[PDB]
Amino acid sequence: EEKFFPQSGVLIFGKQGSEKTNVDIEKVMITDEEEIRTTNPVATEQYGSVSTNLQRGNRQAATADVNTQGVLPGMVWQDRDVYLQGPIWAKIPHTDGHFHPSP
Amino acid sequence: VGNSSGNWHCDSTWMGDRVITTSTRTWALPTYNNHLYKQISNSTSGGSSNDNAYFGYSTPWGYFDFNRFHCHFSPRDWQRLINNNWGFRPKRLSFKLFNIQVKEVTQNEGTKTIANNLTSTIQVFTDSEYQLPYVLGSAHQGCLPPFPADVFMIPQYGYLTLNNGSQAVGRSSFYCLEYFPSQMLRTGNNFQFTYTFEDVPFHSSYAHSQSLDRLMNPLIDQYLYYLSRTQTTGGTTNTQTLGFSQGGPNTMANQAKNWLPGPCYRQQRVSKTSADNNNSEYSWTGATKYHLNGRDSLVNPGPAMASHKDDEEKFFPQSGVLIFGKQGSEKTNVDIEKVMITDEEEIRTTNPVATEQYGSVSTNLQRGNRQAATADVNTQGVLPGMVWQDRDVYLQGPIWAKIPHTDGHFHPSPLMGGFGLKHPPPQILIKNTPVPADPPTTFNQSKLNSFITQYSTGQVSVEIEWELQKENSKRWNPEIQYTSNYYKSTSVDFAVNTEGVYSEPRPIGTRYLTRNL
Ligand SMILES: O=S(=O)(O)OC[C@H]1O[C@@](COS(=O)(=O)O)(O[C@H]2O[C@H](COS(=O)(=O)O)[C@@H](OS(=O)(=O)O)[C@H](OS(=O)(=O)O)[C@H]2OS(=O)(=O)O)[C@@H](OS(=O)(=O)O)[C@@H]1OS(=O)(=O)O
Ligand SMILES: O=S(=O)(O)OC[C@H]1O[C@@](COS(=O)(=O)O)(O[C@H]2O[C@H](COS(=O)(=O)O)[C@@H](OS(=O)(=O)O)[C@H](OS(=O)(=O)O)[C@H]2OS(=O)(=O)O)[C@@H](OS(=O)(=O)O)[C@@H]1OS(=O)(=O)O
Ligand SMILES: [Mg+2]
Ligand SMILES: [Mg+2]
């Protein structure tokens, strides 16, 4: 699925000589993430499917779809890549509640 | 008898990075259930279903309720701490109870007389191993008098175990503290012990200067682009094109950010005015609640959230924040006139608004034939890239809590705000020595029930050492501070009405000092 990519999911880098607006795909270099398809799901894709209520001998068994999700124990992933044509490090917000402050 | 136990030591001190304070007060200790245990389950409930099920007992003993601030600190000092330091935590603690006085009481023909019975004694201890159900942290009332001169009584003690509504599973334990060591103490005999905390992140007592959405410079743009043109507004043939833009000093909303708002949970937006609320009883129905073993229940005093957005003073989460009735509030249906609802117009920088939606996500997969769907997202979970700040302090509230000794826990920061500990300060329990009344002259197989109604008093000492972080910021402009309104009022704030009974005009938070995010 090279054609499709997250609308705002990844990064965009215009080749040398790009104006400020409405430039075309001809100029930028969109970041393909066909690499993490091992651990991390696809944002453009659904995530899972869960039970809707409680099937029974009279009422049919429902199966709800799950697009958005949260985190739970038993989950492992890998943050975004590097892209030297991009940022190198970031700044963590000095607050109290933070989690896996990976950029 | 011919000697007192300990002076009255109750003041505050600011040695700088530390601040020691203690509160000396007096109490009273009445007998209970006539020194008898009880089995309190939904058999004494009288109404509730598997929703308010409870199976526990009632111990004749009592415990201490000093888990608050307005009862440990004075108003001014609180102000002192708040307006000066960014963060703080508790370091050391001590406890002393003495000058005990037992007074038996006879009741001859409605004509009762209170004499003194020094011959008696008392027994009290502390649960270090945390083998007893931690009760505090539930923020039950009957706390130390948020005032010094007034004395009070120690609340009885009762706990609960696993239960199947009106009954209990075998896995429903049973406890009896009288199976523990207790510093048997007679009058004239003093009592003291010592405790120390462990490391805990200082409650971030500060307000942020910027916001997640606005932490980026304006004068510049982002060499990074984004999809700002799905179609081509080149006329009436708005085909499917791909225009892109960068960090517009105006399009900063569409700009690029690296962090994300903390987790959330959708609440029901109510209002302080009446006519703004619909006309239906959703207090227990249209409310935000969870489910557990059928025992469905609320999901607050809180969540990890901020009350509302800008200029929405009228609306507040239904059950999102705390509620504190001014001095002199009954048990039910009192009106908004009495309580002091907690406004959270402070965290609108990091944490979203529970009464508000959270986000909006793609529903399926747009295409040239089928339209692009956009689903709404009220509830959420947590993910990397999320940062927030737990609830505030509210000295008219809890001070710390108790972490459940389990395996799986996460950011055990309390939902009632405050501090959590894997090994919290113990629970103090006391009882009056069972004085068996006149026993039968001849033998009897049964046990003794007859006693002498008696109680005692004494002084509660509690040294709380404190750590702090003061504002070192170069905020050129005068940040905001908290101060009693400088005008003239009839009854001064936190003052004693002409009847000695004093109250608190308003609740107080910490996030005051403008700390750069
Ligand atoms: O307790 S639960 O609501 O969770 O559900 C299990 C039992 O509830 C029923 C009936 O309710 S009861 O008053 O608690 O006994 O719920 C299911 O049916 C009720 C009304 O149905 S019924 O024809 O009288 O049995 C509906 O709603 S409600 O009770 O929640 O107000 C529910 O269905 S619907 O999708 O709105 O049509 C349904 O419950 S649920 O929404 O799935 O939770 C009985 O359900 S049943 O198993 O499907 O028949 C259960 O009791 S039972 O008599 O043993 O069946
Ligand atoms: O594989 S997916 O289901 O995820 O979707 C992409 C392709 O599936 C279609 C058709 O299905 S196929 O049998 O796998 O080739 O799904 C979309 O349409 C199907 C039935 O449509 S169609 O007219 O025969 O093309 C619907 O359902 S289902 O296949 O899941 O049972 C879906 O639509 S609906 O909302 O229920 O009406 C729809 O898929 S989805 O629910 O969005 O996942 C084709 O979809 S399309 O791109 O919208 O046309 C895709 O294949 S395609 O032939 O290349 O288009
Ligand atoms: Mg239901
Ligand atoms: Mg589908």
Side-chain angles (χ1 to χ4, degrees), chain A residues 45-46 65, chain B residues 363-365 370:
Chain A
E45 273 288 1
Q46 72 166 63
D65 191 56
Chain B
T363 314
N364 57 331
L365 327 166
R370 180 168 54 183

Side-chain angles (χ1 to χ4, degrees), chain A residues 94, chain B residues 17 84-88 202 467-471 515:
Chain A
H94 203 172
Chain B
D17 52 299
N84 295 303
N85 310 291
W86 283 323
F88 64 166
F202 309 56
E467 180 61 355
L468 39 158
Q469 298 183 62
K470 39 60 187 178
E471 183 269 60
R515 193 181 194 299

Side-chain angles (χ1 to χ4, degrees), chain A residues 12 20 22 44 91 95-97, chain B residues 204 225 229 244 259 387-388:
Chain A
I12 310 76
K20 211 192 83 63
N22 313 174
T44 64
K91 162 59 167 53
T95 66
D96 57 74
Chain B
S204 57
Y225 295 109
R229 271 194 168 301
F244 293 116
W259 296 145
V387 47
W388 65 108

